[PDB]
Amino acid sequence: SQIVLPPHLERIREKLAENIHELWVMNKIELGWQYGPVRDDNKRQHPCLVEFSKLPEQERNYNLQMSLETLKTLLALGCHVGISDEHAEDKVKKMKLPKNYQLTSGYKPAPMDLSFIKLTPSQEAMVDKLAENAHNVWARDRIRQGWTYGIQQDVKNRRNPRLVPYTLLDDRTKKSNKDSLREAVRTLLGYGYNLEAPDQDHAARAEVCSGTGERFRIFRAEKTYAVKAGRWYFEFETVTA
């Protein structure tokens, strides 16, 4: 709420959301799966492969808000974005694909030259962090709608297994949204806007999370076993260093 969206990032973000949707639809296309009319997942049909003109208002809006929240949170991390080259919009090239790859909607997605990108490990860790943030946003929406966590998915009790912290999140959905956000940030880069991240911070948390009373536990022999003469020896195995 504190930060505000610059206009240029907006006039790029509408097409950012559009080509995120293009990513998703072509993921489906090369997976080979097709659209289905009826809102039934189990009936071997999928109501998501919808033309952008007939695309649900709520779904397009939900994508638009994830895009704005993603770019805004990226800015709020301390990352600052710069337009070094205006010529990206001129050099930007469509990949030629066979007509069979085009979906029934009639619009042809154009995935650009993402491969030329140079990627830094801080930037992948950052992309993972925003994937975590998107998962947190989704979990917050589910919780306020009333969904709770469960080991087994049940719509009647509104219990879902994916409502878990990102560290414990299943790798399937983790990579599933990781690739989408990776492509989003990748295209934001490819359009001539490079991002510059704040430097990584090193710190020692010391895993201090014990009770207030105890920070350490002291074990000892009984006082009656005190030795006052001689040579004595014992051993201490360290299971954890």
Ligand SMILES: Nc1ncnc2c1ncn2[C@@H]1O[C@H](COP(=O)(O)OP(=O)(O)OP(=O)(O)O)[C@@H](O)[C@H]1O
């Ligand atoms: N990894 C992903 N990348 C991009 N879009 C995704 C991804 N996973 C899901 N989506 C899309 O986002 C929306 C997810 O909402 P959905 O209807 O699946 O939620 P839900 O039924 O509340 O979920 P759940 O029952 O798993 O808690 C759908 O429009 C779906 O197509």
